[PDB]
Ligand binder design. Structure first.
Ligand SMILES: *CCC(=O)Nc1cc(-c2c[nH]c3ncnc(Nc4ccc(CN5C(=O)c6ccccc6C5=O)cc4)c23)ccc1OCCN(C)C
Length: 268
């Protein structure tokens, strides 16, 4: 463990100012990191996890935090600091444009094929990096990609989403890099539908049944057959018949070189 990469923060070195959002795991704040013996105030996001009645040992928490601080890839969020009190607080850079799901919904009529395909490349690059580090994400979804600037996104929320899960994960709790590929395909489908809800109107309890019957998410209107075929391959029942992230990078990078040819958007 490269301990230098993780700042262990005193409570007095950061301040929560605004609420960004609150969830089941915890609450995310916008605030300032004011490191001791520096002369700077750094805007940060601070996620305070809900207090555990039975907390993991701090050595075990820190062991995982060192991994999160070790990630070095433009398309994966990095843990800048941790504060260990009665709660765990995670400090990372602010991503001012929010989550990519909200971003695509809110800008749908101004999003072209180059933007979309670039996001697919960037997410595949981040996931390939996580696979190279032997980390399985388990919850890739458009809601778990954050937008640093409109054309620089990063994966977050790692370290029950039935409608993103590979069938083997639903039925057998099996999580792998290839089940992450299934989730990648669903994420791409979210982007290409400008943030539609997958299997809208189908309860989560019925998802494994419709998947077992061979049904899949439908071809997005803007998607040419080449793009949809890649998505469909991510949802093969045999996990080793799905694309690898390294292949997805290559394929979406080629499509990003000629984006109008692969996506059909009114206005480009
Ligand atoms: C899609 C809806 C949504 O996410 N809303 C939402 C956005 C944000 C948010 C906005 N701007 C942000 N800038 C930075 N960070 C966050 N959120 C955030 C997420 C997760 C963590 C914790 N964390 C990691 O998962 C991780 C991985 C790897 C390395 C480091 C870290 C790490 O620190 C911190 C911050 C931003 C916040 C909250 C939002 O809503 C949350 C509740 N849902 C239910 C809406």
């Amino acid at each position: 463990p490269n301990q230098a990469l993780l700042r262990i923060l005193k409570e007095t070195e950061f301040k929560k100012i605004k609420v960004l959002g609150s969830g089941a795991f915890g609450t995310v704040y916008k605030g300032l990191w004011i490191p001791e013996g520096e002369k700077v105030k750094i805007p940060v996001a601070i996620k305070e996890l809900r207090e555990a009645t039975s907390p993991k040992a701090n050595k075990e928490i820190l062991d995982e935090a060192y991994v999160m601080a070790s990630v070095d890839n433009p398309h994966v969020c990095r843990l800048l600091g941790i504060c260990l009190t009665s709660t765990v607080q995670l400090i990372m850079q602010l991503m001012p444009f929010g989550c990519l799901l909200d971003y695509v919904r809110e800008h749908k009529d101004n999003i072209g094929s180059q933007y979309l395909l670039n996001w697919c490349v960037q997410i595949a690059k981040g996931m390939n990096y996580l696979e190279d580090r032997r980390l399985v994400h388990r919850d890739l979804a458009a809601r778990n990609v954050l937008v640093k600037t409109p054309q620089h996104v990063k994966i977050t929320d790692f370290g029950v989403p039935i409608k993103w899960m590979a069938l083997e994960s639903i039925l057998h709790r099996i999580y792998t890099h290839q089940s992450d590929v299934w989730s990648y395909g669903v994420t791409v489908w979210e982007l290409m539908t400008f943030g539609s809800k997958p299997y809208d109107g189908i309860p989560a309890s019925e998802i494994s049944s419709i998947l077992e019957k061979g049904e899949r998410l439908p071809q997005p209107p803007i998607c040419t057959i080449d793009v949809y075929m890649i998505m469909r391959k991510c949802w093969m029942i045999d996990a080793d018949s799905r694309p690898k992230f390294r292949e997805l990078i290559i394929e979406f990078s080629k499509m990003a070189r000629d984006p109008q040819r692969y996506l059909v958007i009114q206005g480009d």
